[PDB]
Design an enzyme around this catalytic site. Structure first.
Site, mmCIF file in Angstrom:
data_model
loop_
_atom_site.group_PDB
_atom_site.id
_atom_site.type_symbol
_atom_site.label_atom_id
_atom_site.label_comp_id
_atom_site.label_asym_id
_atom_site.label_seq_id
_atom_site.Cartn_x
_atom_site.Cartn_y
_atom_site.Cartn_z
ATOM 1 N NE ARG A 1 -64.290 41.738 -50.159
ATOM 2 C CZ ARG A 1 -63.910 40.536 -49.791
ATOM 3 N NH1 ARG A 1 -62.659 40.251 -49.634
ATOM 4 N NH2 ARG A 1 -64.792 39.632 -49.551
ATOM 5 N N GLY B 1 -67.638 36.971 -53.842
ATOM 6 C CA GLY B 1 -66.886 35.920 -54.449
ATOM 7 C C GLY B 1 -66.951 35.909 -55.955
ATOM 8 N N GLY C 1 -68.069 34.881 -48.190
ATOM 9 C CA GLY C 1 -68.319 34.076 -47.028
ATOM 10 C C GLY C 1 -69.344 34.741 -46.118
#
Ligand SMILES: Nc1ncnc2c1ncn2[C@@H]1O[C@H](COP(=O)(O)OP(=O)(O)CP(=O)(O)O)[C@@H](O)[C@H]1O
Length: 413
Positions: A35, A370, A393
């Site tokens: 990330r 994920g 998500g």
């Protein structure tokens, strides 16, 4: 459509940038930095293009609106970011208030600042839990003040937090600057997802894996309207096999709510001409353990019960491969076995091998965030698929056909 960073003049401007630095942790040690790296391109662009400052804000975990500096601080992220950027990062121990505002008012040119976890404040999510664990609500005046404070930190706003784009949180939709731009990560993520969903290359294959069916009905349904093929794997498959095929599944996961609509979903598929690939064989376990005794079963043999099936077998991997070979575009959301454990990872690894192979011959390969992204790290294949998404998500919402509030809130171009 929406203003993006490439179109934004940042020279001599303070940029307050929402990012998703909600990275996996252990003992306050970051275990995947995917990330963080993903945001570097927007940050560098701002710096290379003369931004006075970049002030970075994110949540980490779910502290639920109370300070948790020993469990959920972004301090470790500031350390990792300095390393990725080759530049100092100034870490602030808060995200709002007069002291942070002073810090960000007029920084030395080129300053990179990371604020503390937004979620230490109930104002970010707008609700949370008190330090005794009771549900609580943020107050409107305080939410406005929270937003006002964050707003003070930049001249212009950039949202690169694709991973959080599904959340209508204060940092994401509540910033009161006129220029609100999507970052390079936000742009990149949406481009791959749009092409995939609006304008796919075909055949378009969706690989959907996971534990339960009930929580995926919108997703399967929407995907059935878009794809040419679908693989359904992982724990969720047993529900389909039991209902459709009369399979004896032993103690394998079974979704009672899901079983009710499995037929309807298969009808939609048939009607739409979508080829469904379910597993035909399995790696069985005598119990739900990393080190369980393992066996093998077929749909016809049954799972001898209550053993459970925790991976697909070799023949399933072959059918999956055949589908992958057919595909010109793939979206993969969900491992096909319990990849966390080596005895049950084989199906996932093989599929990864196939997906990598497809990429090398030009298949457009999109990996949902994920667990599937985690697998990409685990097997070192992030640079070997077209896109590894940073948002699980969030990406699921798009895949369900939903609007992302984080995108909607950006300025129109
Ligand atoms: N045959 C199988 N039986 C039981 N579990 C399986 C399985 N195949 C895969 N899994 C498990 O499915 C999990 C992912 O399933 P799921 O549908 O719950 O996504 P998730 O738990 O990531 C939702 P959340 O985003 O809240 O974590 C993985 O942890 C994997 O171990």
């Amino acid at each position: 459509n929406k203003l993006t960073l490439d179109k934004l003049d940042v020279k001599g401007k303070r940029v307050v940038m929402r990012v998703d630095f909600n990275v996996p942790m252990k003992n306050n040690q970051i275990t995947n930095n995917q990330r963080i790296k993903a945001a570097v391109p927007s940050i560098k662009f701002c710096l290379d293009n003369g931004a006075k400052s970049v002030v970075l804000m994110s949540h980490l975990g779910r502290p639920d609106g109370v300070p948790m500096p020993d469990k959920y601080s972004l301090e470790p992220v500031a350390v990792e970011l300095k390393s990725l950027l080759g530049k100092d990062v100034l870490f602030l121990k808060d995200c709002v208030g007069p002291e942070v505002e002073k810090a960000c008012a007029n920084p030395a040119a080129g300053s990179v600042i990371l604020l503390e976890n937004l979620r230490f404040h109930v104002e970010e999510e707008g609700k949370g839990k008190d330090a005794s664990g009771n549900k609580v609500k943020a107050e409107p005046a305080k939410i406005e003040a929270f937003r006002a404070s964050l707003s003070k930190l930049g001249d212009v706003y950039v949202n690169d937090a694709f991973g959080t784009a599904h959340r209508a949180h204060s940092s994401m939709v509540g910033v009161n600057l006129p220029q609100k731009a999507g970052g390079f990560l936000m742009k990149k993520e949406l481009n791959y997802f749009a092409k995939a969903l609006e304008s796919p290359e075909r055949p378009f294959l969706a690989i959907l894996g996971g534990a339960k069916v009930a929580d995926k009905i919108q997703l399967i349904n929407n995907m059935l309207d878009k794809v040419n093929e679908m693989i359904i794997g992982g724990g969720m498959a047993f529900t389909f096999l039991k209902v459709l095929n009369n399979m004896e599944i032993g103690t394998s996961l079974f979704d009672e709510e899901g079983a009710k609509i499995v037929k309807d979903l298969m009808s939609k598929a048939e009607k739409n001409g979508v080829k469904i690939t379910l597993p035909v064989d399995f790696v069985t376990a005598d119990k739900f353990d990393e080190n369980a005794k393992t066996g093998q079963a077929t749909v016809a043999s049954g799972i001898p019960a209550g053993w459970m099936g925790l991976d697909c077998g070799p023949e399933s991997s072959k059918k999956y491969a055949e589908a992958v070979t057919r595909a010109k575009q793939i979206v993969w959301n969900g491992p096909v076995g319990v990849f966390e454990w080596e005895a049950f990872a084989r199906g996932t690894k093989a599929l990864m091998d196939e997906v990598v192979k497809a990429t090398s011959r030009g298949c457009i390969t999109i990996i949902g965030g994920g667990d599937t992204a985690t697998c990409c790290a685990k097997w070192n294949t992030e640079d070997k698929v077209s896109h590894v998404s940073t948002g699980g998500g969030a990406s699921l919402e798009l895949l369900e056909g939903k609007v992302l509030p984080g995108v909607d809130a950006l300025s129109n171009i």
